[PDB]
Structure formats: structure tokens, C-alpha cells
Structure 1
Amino acid sequence: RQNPHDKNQNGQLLKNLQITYEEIGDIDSLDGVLRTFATGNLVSKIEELQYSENWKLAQDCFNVLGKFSDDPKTTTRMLKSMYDHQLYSQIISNSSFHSSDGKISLSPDVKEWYSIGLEAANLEGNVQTLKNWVEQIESLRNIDDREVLLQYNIAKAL
């Protein structure tokens, strides 16, 4: 409000504004923020689907946006949209982890992937895909991540 909002400062203000609603528990303002003064990209019109009962229409749109291999965050958007809708068996069967059998090396943003992939593997009880998973985790060097190690310890407990 203190900004004159009629100008074009509403590009850098919004990409973290939706962050401050999508985990606050409120949805009906987030869906109201997305459909007002933010109608440039069509991907913004796609992400309104995943909160309004047609979420699986946005899932398989994200799955083929997720097979473009251009950005790492458009992959973790797919993974978080799976995890928010309890598609755990579809998370552990994702090809973004399984290169052939194992996974990639030390993790700048990949740990946010592993945090999901551990957790769904805890929720799908299957000792082989849970056992080779922490076989791949323990090849790492220095797991800095606060979130990975919880689901890791639950996995080795299982």
C-alpha cells in the first residue's frame, strides 16, 4: 500500500508473496492473489488448479513440465505438489531420482528432493526401496540438511 502499486514493482513483490500464503494455512486469498494482477504467465493459471479440487489435472501438467530438465525448482515444485496430495508411491517411483538405479552426488538443492523421497519411502512400506535408498544416502559425505536426517533416521528405524 505504501508503494504506488500502479507501477511495475509487482513482479518482484509477488514471487515471495505466494510463499507467504501457501504454508500459512490460508488458501482463498492465495487463489485470490493468483487471479488478480498476475495474469501474464500461463503457468500461474496452471498452479491455481492444485488448490481447487482439480489438483490431478495440475499434477500431470507438472509431470510433463517436470520432464524439461531446464530448472531444478520446476522439479521440486512437482515433488511438493505430489507430497501435498499424498502421492507417495508416485514420489518414490519418480525418474528424477532413479538415473538408472542410484542417485546423484552432494546436494545444493537436491536435498530438498531427498527430503521428499525419504519421507514417501517411509510412508510406503517396502524394505527394498527403503533399503537401497539409505544405501544411497550413506554414500554421502557431510549431510548438512536439518530435514533429511529426521526422515533418514525414521527410515533406518523401519
Structure 2
Amino acid sequence: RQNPHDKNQNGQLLKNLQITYEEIGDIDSLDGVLRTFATGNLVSKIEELQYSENWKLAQDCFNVLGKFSDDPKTTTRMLKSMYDHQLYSQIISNSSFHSSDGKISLSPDVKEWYSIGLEAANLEGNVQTLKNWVEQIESLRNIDDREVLLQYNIAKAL
């Protein structure tokens, strides 16, 4: 309000404003801000579908946006959108982890991927896809991530 919102500061204002609604619990202002004064890119119109009963129409759009291998964050958008819609078996079968069988080294943003991977591997009970995931976790050196180690410990409990 105090910023003159007639001017074009609403690009850097909104890339975190929608984050402040998508884990506050409220959707009906998130869906209201994503369709008001933020309608440049079509991908933003695709991200309205993942909260409005046609979420699987947005999932398979993200599955091929997320198979462009150009951004690290358009992959974790797909992974968080799978996790929010309970597609655990589809997370553990993703090619973002299985290059051939194993995964890449120490984690800049892959810790956000490995958290979702361990958690989905826990929620589908299969000792083989859970027992070789911890073969890959335990090959690391110094795991700093607060979020990975919980689902790791649940994994080794299982």
C-alpha cells in the first residue's frame, strides 16, 4: 500500500508474497493473487491448477517442464507438488534421482530433493528402495541438513 503499486515494483514484491500464502494455509488469497496483477507468464496460470481440483492437469505439465534440465528449482517445484499430493511412489520412481541407479554428490539444493526422496521412500514400504537410498545417504561426508536427517533416521528405523 505505501509503495506506489501503480509502478512496477510488483515483480520483486510477489515472488515471495505467494510463498507467504502457500504455507500459511490460505489458498483463496494465493489463488486470488496468482490471478490478479501477476498474469504475465503462462506457467503462473499453470500453477493455479495445483490447488483447484485439477491438480493432476498441473502435475503432468510440471513433469515435462521439470524434464528440461535447465533449472535446479523447477525440479524441486515438481517434487514438492508431488509430495503435497501424496504421489510417493511417483517420487521414488523419478529420474531426477535415478541417473542410472545412484545419485550425485554433496548437496547444494539436492538436500531439498533428498528430503522428499527419503520421506516418500519411507511412506511406501519397500526394503529395497529404502535400503539402497541409505547406501547413498551414508556415502556423503558431512550432512548439515536438519530436514534430511529426520527421514534418514526414520528410514534406518524401518
Scaled by the length of structure 1, the TM-score of the pair is 1.00
Name the residue aligned to 2:52.
52
Alpha-carbon separation, structure 2, partners of 1:150 and 1:38: 37
Q: State the number of aligned residues.
A: 158
How do 1:45-84 residues align onto structure 2 when only pairs under 5 Å count?
A: 45-84=45-84
Alpha-carbon separation, structure 2, partners of 1:4 and 1:59: 36
1:95 Cα shift?
A: 0.2
SS of residue paired to 2:98: coil
Name the residue aligned to 1:38.
38
1:126 Cα shift?
A: 0.1
SS of residue paired to 2:113: helix
SS of residue paired to 1:86: coil
1:153 Cα shift?
A: 0.1
Name the residue aligned to 1:149.
149
SS of residue paired to 1:20: helix
1:91 Cα shift?
A: 0.2
Runs of 4+ in 1 over 4 A off after TM superposition: none
Cα shift readout 1:50-86 (whole Å, capped 9, x = no counterpart): 0000000000000000110000000000000000000
How much is the aligned-residue C-alpha RMSD, in angstroms? 0.3
Cα shift readout 1:18-70 (whole Å, capped 9, x = no counterpart): 00000000000000000000000000000000000000000000000011000
1:17 maps to 2:17: yes
1:11 Cα shift?
A: 0.4
Alpha-carbon separation, structure 2, partners of 1:136 and 1:34: 38
Alpha-carbon separation, structure 2, partners of 1:153 and 1:40: 43
SS of residue paired to 1:141: coil
Percent sequence identity over aligned pairs: 100
Scaled by the length of structure 2, the TM-score of the pair is 1.00
1:8 Cα shift?
A: 0.4
SS of residue paired to 1:60: helix
SS of residue paired to 1:152: helix
SS of residue paired to 1:27: coil
Cα shift readout 1:97-155 (whole Å, capped 9, x = no counterpart): 00100000000000000000000000000000000000000000000000000000000
Alpha-carbon separation, structure 2, partners of 1:39 and 1:104: 36
